[PDB]
Structures are given as structure tokens and as C-alpha cells.
Amino acid sequence: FGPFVETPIPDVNTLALEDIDVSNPFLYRQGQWRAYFKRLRDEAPVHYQKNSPFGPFWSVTRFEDILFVDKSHDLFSAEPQIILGDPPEGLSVEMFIAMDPPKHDVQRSSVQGVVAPKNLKEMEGLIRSRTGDVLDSLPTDKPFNWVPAVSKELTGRMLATLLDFPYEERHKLVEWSDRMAGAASATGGEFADENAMFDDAADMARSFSRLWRDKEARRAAGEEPGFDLISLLQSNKETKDLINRPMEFIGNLTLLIVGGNDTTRNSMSGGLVAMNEFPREFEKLKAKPELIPNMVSEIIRWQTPLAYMRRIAKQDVELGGQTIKKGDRVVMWYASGNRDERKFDNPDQFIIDRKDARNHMSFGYGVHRCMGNRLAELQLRILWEEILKRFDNIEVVEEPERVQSNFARGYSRLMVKLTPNS
Numbered sequence: 001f002g003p004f005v006e007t008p009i010p011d012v013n014t015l016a017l018e019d020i021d022v023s024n025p026f027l028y029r030q031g032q033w034r035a036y037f038k039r040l041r042d043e044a045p046v047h048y049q050k051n052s053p054f055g056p057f058w059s060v061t062r063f064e065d066i067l068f069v070d071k072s073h074d075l076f077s078a079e080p081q082i083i084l085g086d087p088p089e090g091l092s093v094e095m096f097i098a099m100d101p102p103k104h105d106v107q108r109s110s111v112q113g114v115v116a117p118k119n120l121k122e123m124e125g126l127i128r129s130r131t132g133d134v135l136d137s138l139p140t141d142k143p144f145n146w147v148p149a150v151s152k153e154l155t156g157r158m159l160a161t162l163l164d165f166p167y168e169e170r171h172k173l174v175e176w177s178d179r180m181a182g183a184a185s186a187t188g189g190e191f192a193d194e195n196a197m198f199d200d201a202a203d204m205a206r207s208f209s210r211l212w213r214d215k216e217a218r219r220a221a222g223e224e225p226g227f228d229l230i231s232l233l234q235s236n237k238e239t240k241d242l243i244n245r246p247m248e249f250i251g252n253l254t255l256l257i258v259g260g261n262d263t264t265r266n267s268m269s270g271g272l273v274a275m276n277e278f279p280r281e282f283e284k285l286k287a288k289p290e291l292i293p294n295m296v297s298e299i300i301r302w303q304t305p306l307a308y309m310r311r312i313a314k315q316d317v318e319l320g321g322q323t324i325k326k327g328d329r330v331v332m333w334y335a336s337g338n339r340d341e342r343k344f345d346n347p348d349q350f351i352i353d354r355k356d357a358r359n360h361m362s363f364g365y366g367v368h369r370c371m372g373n374r375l376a377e378l379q380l381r382i383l384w385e386e387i388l389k390r391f392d393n394i395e396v397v398e399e400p401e402r403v404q405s406n407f408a409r410g411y412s413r414l415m416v417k418l419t420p421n422s
């Protein structure tokens with residue numbers, strides 16, 4: 001009903017404050033995002049942009065203010081979408097990441113068992129084995145792209161395990177997720193073909209339905225239930241009939257794959273980029289390997305794989321000396337908050353023994369705090385544990401290529417030369 005090409009981004013000092021548009025999906029790639037958000041934090045921490053390709057929106061850029069917006073779901077709704085823009089027509093799917101309580105609470109309870117700490121503990125052998133195997137497969141006499149060989153490879157195996165997806169088809173979960181999460185209308189991503197998105201959403205719905213029916217058929221034949229989400233959903237009375245609720249069914253399954261896809265991937269890659277910019281931290285790590293758990297938090301803080309989550313004001317809200325109007329879109333820029341010097345001293349430095357590194361907001365805060373935070377930290381810890389066993393040095397031999405997006409902060413190309421230890 002009713003009615004992106006890259007260009008050089010100018011110095012933020014050349015702009016009136018009302019003309020700063022941080023929805024530009026090239027701000028991260030071009031390294032301008034730090035100066036743009038710092039100007040916002042300093043002089044417009046609750047900022048209204050009237051004109052953007054996504055329409056008007058508020059930017060909330062200070063750590064303390066983002067906490068308030070994220071935790072106050074009675075003032076700022078997560079519905080109906082948490083990306084800055086809109087999904088293409090015909091591709092809206094309800095996910096509980098874009099739902100307020102109580103309904104958010106009910107839907108998250110039906111899937112949260114898949115990351116139960118007892119289950120993650122039991123899967124450590126498999127994760128570490130996969131993490132050992134891919135690392136042993138990497139060449140040490142020539143450089144290679146770390147993104148497909150390591151980050152995406154380990155991420156895709158993990159996603160397959162989570163759903164018991166056919167392993168040989170796991171590349172499909174990632175390709176579908178990338179196209180869906182990289183919609184030009186939603187995040188300024190490079191996917192602008194609505195035809196391919198319609199084909200993906202149909203292949204994906206058909207694939208999840210086949211997986212559901214194959215699993216119930218295997219369970220009816222006596223196969224013991226497992227750790228995966230489908231086994232868990234078919235073991236609980238509330239969700240044993242979830243296929244008869246297609247919106248809930250597709251919504252929960254797509255959220256799990258999109259939630260863990262480029263987040264895990266870009267956190268695996270981003271640690272190497274941070275180490276490259278701050279090489280003394282790798283010597284500190286080698287001499288004190290017990291720093292790995294805290295370093296994982298510092299990698300996640302420094303990388304902030306998801307730059308923001310978006311809300312809609314449910315009423316007029318006074319915040320930062322401004323009046324957010326009912327209905328306005330409000331963007332909580334985690335990428336800015338994690339660089340806020342009011343919260344972190346020396347915020348742009350990668351400091352692996354930073355004592356308050358675990359207080360980052362890359363997972364958000366409030367009822368929507370990332371459900372897979374422990375799963376992500378676990379894979380990242382194991383990754384660096386297995387790196388230290390094998391490699392005395394790691395070299396980035398080319399400027400990393402960063403992904404076009406205002407939402408995902410990640411890398412498509414990371415060329416790495418490995419040096420084994422003695």
C-alpha cells in the first residue's frame with residue numbers, strides 16, 4: 001500500500017552536525033566511523049538525522065545512554081525490526097530479537113536450551129577437534145584468505161551442528177543468511193536483488209520443513225534425541241507441533257542461523273586484525289596464555305561485530321537534552337558505546353588484559369542480550385588456544401577488505417601468512 005555506490009567520505013569537520021549520516025554503509029570500510037561517532041558522542045549524543053536512504057532516525061552513541069534505551073523496553077520497542085531500514089517486501093519474518101516481552105520471553109524460552117551450558121560443555125571436544133583440524137590444514141609456506149578458510153569454515157560447521165543441518169549443505173545456511181542479512185534496504189548491504197531473496201526464502205523454508213520432517217521421522221524410527229534445536233523443539237510439548245505455526249517456525253530457525261553467522265565469523269577474523277594493529281598484545285598473550293578468556297572479551301569489545309540494534313519509541317522520551325517523538329526510529333550504536341571514553345580508558349586501544357573488557361555492550365543489555373554469547377566466547381577461546389599451540393607468528397600481508405554494511409562490522413578478505421613454532 002502507498003507510494004548504494006561507494007564515494008569518498010569527507011572529513012567529519014566539513015559537516016554541519018545535522019548533516020552527519022552514520023547510516024552510510026561504507027563508514028566502517030573507509031575508517032571514518034571512529035571520527036563520525038566521536039563527534040556525535042561529543043556534541044550530539046542523541047542525534048536526529050532527517051534525511052537518509054532509510055528515512056529519518058535517531059542515533060544514540062554514548063555507552064550510558066545506550067544502556068538506558070536497551071534496558072527500557074517499556075519505552076523503546078524492539079518491534080517490528082531491529083535493523084536500521086526495512087526488509088524487502090515479502091521477506092518480513094518475525095524473530096524474537098524484534099519482539100517485546102512478554103512474547104519475546106516465551107519465544108526465547110523455546111530455543112534457549114540449544115545453548116544450555118551443559119550442552120556447550122559436552123561439545124567442546126567437537127569444536128576443538130574442528131578447530132585443530134582446520135588450523136592444521138592451513139598452508140604455512142604461502143598466504144591465504146583467513147575468512148573462508150577459518151572464520152567461515154568453523155562458523156558453518158557450528159551452525160550445522162546447532163540445527164543438525166545436512167553437513168554437506170551447511171554452505172547453504174551461510175549463503176542464505178548472508179543474502180537475507182545483507183539486504184540493501186535493511187543494512188545498506190550489497191544484496192539488492194529481490195528475486196534472489198525470494199528464491200532464498202523459499203529454498204530456506206522448504207529446507208527447514210524437510211529437515212523437520214526428516215528429524216521427526218528419524219525420532220519415530222528410534223533415533224535418540226540430540227543437542228540440536230530441532231531435537232529440542234520436538235522434545236517439548238509446547239513446540240512439538242511448531243511446524244503448524246509457520247511464522248514461529250521459520251522465524252526461530254532463521255534467527256538462530258543469522259544470529260550466529262557473521263557475528264562468529266567476524267569475531268574470529270577481527271582478533272587477528274586487532275593483533276595486527278597492536279602487535280605487543282600477541283607477545284603478552286604468548287607469555288601469559290591464561291589471558292585468553294579476557295582477551296576474547298576485548299576482541300568482542302574492539303570488533304563489535306554488530307554495530308547497532310534499532311528500536312522504536314513507544315512514546316515521547318526525553319534523552320540527552322532532546323525529545324525523541326513517539327514512532328521515531330532509535331539506533332543504539334554499540335560500535336560507538338564500546339569506544340566511549342566515559343566508559344573505557346584508551347577506548348581505541350586493543351588491550352587484552354583490560355580489566356573491564358567484559359563490560360562491553362557488543363552483546364547488548366536488557367532482555368535481548370545475546371543468547372549465543374557463551375557459545376561465541378567458547379569458540380573464540382578454543383580458536384586462540386589452538387592457535388597458540390601451533391603458530392609462533394601471524395602476519396597480515398595485505399590491507400583487510402571490510403564488508404559494505406552499516407550493521408555487520410566485518411571482513412571479506414584477510415590475507416594471512418602463518419609461521420609455525422619450533
Ligand code: HEM
Nearest residue numbers: 096097259260263267309362363364365368370371372376
Ligand atoms: C561475538 C559474537 C556475537 C555478537 C557480537 C552478537 C551480537 C548480538 C546482539 C547485539 C544482539 C541483540 C542485543 C540487544 O538487542 O540488546 C544479539 C542477540 C541474539 N543473538 Fe547474538 N551475537 C553473537 C553471537 C551469537 C551466536 C553465536 C548466536 C547463535 C548461536 C547468536 C544468536 C542470537 C540470538 C538468537 C539473539 C536474540 C536474543 C534475544 O532477542 O533475546 N548470537 N546478538
